Design a protein around this ligand. Sequence first.
Ligand SMILES: Nc1ncnc2c1ncn2[C@@H]1O[C@H](COS(=O)(=O)NC(=O)[C@@H](N)CO)[C@@H](O)[C@H]1O
Ligand SMILES: [Mg+2]
Length: 440
Amino acid sequence: SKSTAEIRQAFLDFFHSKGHQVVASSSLVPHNDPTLLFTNAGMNQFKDVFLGLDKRNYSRATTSQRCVRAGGKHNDLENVGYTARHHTFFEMLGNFSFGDYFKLDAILFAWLLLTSEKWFALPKERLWVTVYESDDEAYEIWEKEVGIPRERIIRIGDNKGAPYASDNFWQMGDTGPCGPCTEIFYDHGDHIWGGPPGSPEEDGDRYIEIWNIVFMQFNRQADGTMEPLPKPSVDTAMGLERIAAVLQHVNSNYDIDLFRTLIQAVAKVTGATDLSNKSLRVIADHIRSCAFLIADGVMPSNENRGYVLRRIIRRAVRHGNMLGAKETFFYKLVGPLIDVMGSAGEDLKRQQAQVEQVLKTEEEQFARTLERGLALLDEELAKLSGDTLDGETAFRLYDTYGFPVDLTADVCRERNIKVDEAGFEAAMEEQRRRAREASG
Ligand SMILES: Nc1ncnc2c1ncn2[C@@H]1O[C@H](COS(=O)(=O)NC(=O)[C@@H](N)CO)[C@@H](O)[C@H]1O
Ligand SMILES: [Mg+2]
């Protein structure tokens, strides 16, 4: 089959022949907005280009952007380990048109790359597409120009039950370029639970969203009002891991080449006994986020981005501990991570030791309170009559043991236990008021 690295190459090449300028992936730290926690999409570095504020010598580009969706408007952290298609760290294979080609060529390029016997050649019967309800052009293009069956062109209205809370209307974040979009889904077939988009069981992992194609029409200014973009443009992202799963004839992103090997490296250093465990996937994912974030200059901390990183690190250590890790293990996964990435882990080779060091200190510190905190937790769980852990307990784990609220929640989740988040909030606010009183 085509390997992950081969797929990334083919994609960039294909769009290069179609006149797309290959641009280097930006860092996970976004200096284009301070507003933004981490790079969450390939279009981020081109945000101001779509607006017309930032000007380039190319009218189309193509990138393989590294993204972390662990925060803000794009937060997939809690999905990690429960689906076979979600990561914190993942790569977006995307093509961009700035004032150049619009819908017809955008859809044509996508179909060509996916279906062509000469490129990488998915079964046509398997593919499904979605369009925004109002998008008649897109529908007609798929139906007439491409030749897709009407039964497989699902229209999606503002179906999240707010104007337009739509899977087919994509917005950058709180502000920025946006517009209706069309998505390409692949059927991994009958054995997986799940139905097509717009269907009750649309969330299930059978029909996977491979490629989103956003027709950039509008800009969201500040206030809610939606001004038009100077020139209609195209923004697409195909998930490298998800398409690799299709091409490599697997169903889970965690069965693709680089995850097969990465999970084995996790089993080695944790003493894990079976390779089909939730925690192995979680750790394999988290090492990608943490290692790359640090390599891009994010130092673990208690403030802002550093804290999100710290949280992910600690959550990963917690899983390793559960698997039976006898000693510091997390930093040992940097090496194997560098191998299974190669071209894409460039910056990560430069600093390897700096990253291994940061990840080592971090785990070494959390381990100082980890197991004692887990005991505190287990005690309190037994005292529980109900399915909800009191907020005071959650606050104690945070205040004393350095357990981020979501980490505690992740532990309780595995036992069908909720954590009373209102109480945690109350306890947290009560300390801010004590700090405010004492300090004045
Ligand atoms: N958490 C995630 N883990 C793995 N892959 C993801 C994740 N989120 C998105 N992707 C992949 O990236 C693709 C694009 O993401 S998208 O939000 O739907 N669309 C966009 O980001 C638009 N900005 C396109 O420029 C998706 O189709 C999916 O294949
Ligand atoms: Mg989506």
